[PDB]
């Protein structure tokens, strides 16, 4: 059951890359929009106190290089949107798919298309963290998203490396994902705990495909599984988890409870030897979602 | 953090197409104005017991052929078999076909896999080609294995057959399969699978490189006593050319092979405990010192 990204094709087309001063990134060409995180305008002194709108004033149109491919675009307005730079250029995107601008809940999952300079590098697919963190290659730009049908949905974009190695960003809006600013700073990241709901869909997965060993005759409430769970660093188990495996349940003919009653056995025991769907380990970045599609 | 990442997939995902024959419908992969797809889409479920190809293919012709390109139909003009590939003609050249080459890969290399159904894409991921041949975890039929070489694109894997453990079998783009497999519904032996030894040695060195260093020592080992502990514990033996292979990472971290096959012993035999490698409580084996030089600068 392998991890599986979108097809990067769409986005491809629509990855720039953007200079000012010294520094170069990655930025999202959107009809006649380049989208990139605000502190390219910064340098290394700058982003230790950074005061975003007293920058921007003294810089121009003629500041900020835009590059698709070996094309330059001209750059004819700039302005700044919550913590992204909206850079408005002379030519709308010939390769515009499609897309739409969403904010995604913590635990939910997408494709990134990492990019080095506005060309195209590499394409996995990732979990947003409880903890608003997307553990990564290590950049800057280079934007998350989902494709429903013939949409693409920008839900992510890459902005600061965090002490610890991981990273944070924000939507395509500017808003970030968690307590994180844009600036070289000590930043509190809380606990990285596993995605239950994730791991019930997994779970259900191997269910659907042959890997039944772990099914037992246990039985369990909610509350009793949540003490066991976070024990283990799980993430607490809600009604509304149980509901959106729902679905799962009918087709597997498990009940969810049933389910937490065979994880609470695996949390305790481990798998002592065995493996579930070729893996040595519990698998927490496949959504309920992902489970049904990729079956 | 580190990162299976596959390879961009739009230059292959305009290559994608459908091909059907009676009932039987699967991916095939659309180059200038040839069609190459399975062969195994001329049978019926009956069939593939015990196929005659050559019997059944003078039994088809141009007519039977359906090619779709999207919402676009294709009409073939002509067919031939090259090996366990079906090679369609058709009236029209595809206009995005990218550089490419035909490749034959060895096992222990990665490459990307885009998954389709019915000529569709759905999703990409990034694999290697395991020592037993086999590869695992896609969805269809005709869904093509590649890597990207700056504009170039190498084509050097296609799904045929899926084995009865969950694996997956197939053949180079000129039509030879990986391994003993064969396109026919029979018993099919995947033998004893093994981890790819030279991969995990570049995946510590990607580690180093990254700041990670926990695991490393100064108990430098034989190229034998590696070896032997290697075997006990289902890896690859390691030969001389691996240790040439891992030139250049064991230059720029500044430590040698040997000490390396010392810090894998250590970690074989010990184990991590709670502490993890790039993120992982596992050892990874499908990045080849290729692929990690390639994220690493």
Same mark, same amino acid.
């Given at each position: 059951?392998?991890?599986?990204?979108?097809?990067?094709?769409? @986005?491809?087309?629509?990855?720039?890359?953007?200079?000012?001063?010294?520094?170069?990134?990655?930025?999202?060409?959107?009809?006649?929009?380049?989208?990139?995180?605000?502190?390219?305008?910064?340098?290394?002194?700058?982003?230790?106190?950074?005061?975003?709108?007293?920058?921007? =004033?003294?810089?121009?149109?003629?500041?900020? !290089?835009?590059?698709?491919?070996? @094309?330059?675009?001209?750059?004819?307005?700039?302005?700044?949107?919550?913590?992204?730079?909206?850079?408005?250029? +002379?030519?709308?995107?010939?390769?515009?798919?499609?897309?739409? &601008?969403?904010? =995604?809940?913590?635990?939910?999952?997408?494709?990134?298309?990492?990019?080095?300079?506005?060309?195209?590098?590499?394409?996995?697919?990732?979990?947003?963290?409880?903890?608003?963190? =997307?553990?990564?290659?290590?950049?800057?730009?280079?934007?998350?998203?989902?494709? +429903?049908?013939?949409? @693409?949905?920008?839900?992510?974009?890459?902005?600061?490396?965090?002490?610890?190695?991981?990273?944070?960003?924000? +939507?395509?809006?500017?808003?970030?994902?968690?307590?994180?600013?844009?600036?070289?700073?000590?930043?509190?990241?809380?606990?990285?705990?596993? *995605?239950?709901?994730?791991?019930?869909?997994?779970?259900?997965?191997?269910?659907?495909?042959?890997?039944?060993?772990?099914?037992?005759? &246990?039985?369990?409430?909610?509350?009793?599984?949540?003490?066991?769970?976070?024990?283990?660093?799980?993430?607490?188990?809600?009604?509304?988890?149980? +509901?959106?495996?729902?679905?799962?349940?009918?087709?597997?003919? *498990?009940?969810?409870?049933?389910?937490?009653?065979? !994880?609470?056995?695996? !949390?305790?025991?481990?798998?002592?030897?065995?493996? *579930?769907?070729?893996?040595? *380990? !519990?698998?927490?970045?496949?959504?309920?979602?992902?489970?049904?599609?990729?079956?």
């Amino acid at each position: 059951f392998r991890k599986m990204a979108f097809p990067s094709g769409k @986005v491809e087309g629509c990855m720039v890359q953007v200079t000012c001063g010294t520094t170069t990134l990655n930025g999202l060409w959107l009809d006649d929009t380049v989208y990139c995180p605000r502190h390219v305008i910064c340098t290394a002194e700058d982003m230790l106190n950074p005061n975003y709108e007293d920058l921007l =004033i003294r810089k121009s149109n003629h500041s900020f !290089l835009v590059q698709a491919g070996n @094309v330059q675009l001209r750059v004819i307005g700039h302005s700044m949107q919550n913590c992204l730079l909206r850079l408005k250029v +002379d030519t709308s995107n010939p390769k515009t798919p499609k897309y739409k &601008f969403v904010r =995604i809940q913590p635990g939910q999952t997408f494709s990134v298309l990492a990019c080095y300079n506005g060309s195209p590098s590499g394409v996995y697919q990732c979990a947003m963290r409880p903890n608003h963190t =997307i553990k990564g290659s290590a950049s800057c730009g280079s934007v998350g998203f989902n494709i +429903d049908y013939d949409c @693409v949905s920008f839900c992510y974009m890459h902005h600061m490396e965090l002490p610890t190695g991981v990273h944070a960003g924000t +939507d395509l809006e500017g808003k970030f994902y968690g307590p994180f600013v844009d600036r070289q700073t000590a930043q509190a990241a809380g606990t990285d705990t596993t *995605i239950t709901l994730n791991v019930l869909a997994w779970l259900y997965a191997a269910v659907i495909n042959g890997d039944r060993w772990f099914l037992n005759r &246990f039985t369990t409430t909610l509350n009793d599984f949540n003490l066991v769970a976070m024990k283990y660093n799980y993430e607490p188990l809600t009604q509304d988890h149980v +509901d959106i495996l729902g679905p799962l349940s009918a087709q597997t003919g *498990i009940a969810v409870l049933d389910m937490c009653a065979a !994880l609470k056995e695996l !949390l305790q025991n481990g798998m002592n030897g065995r493996t *579930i769907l070729g893996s040595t *380990i !519990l698998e927490d970045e496949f959504t309920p979602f992902d489970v049904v599609r990729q079956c």
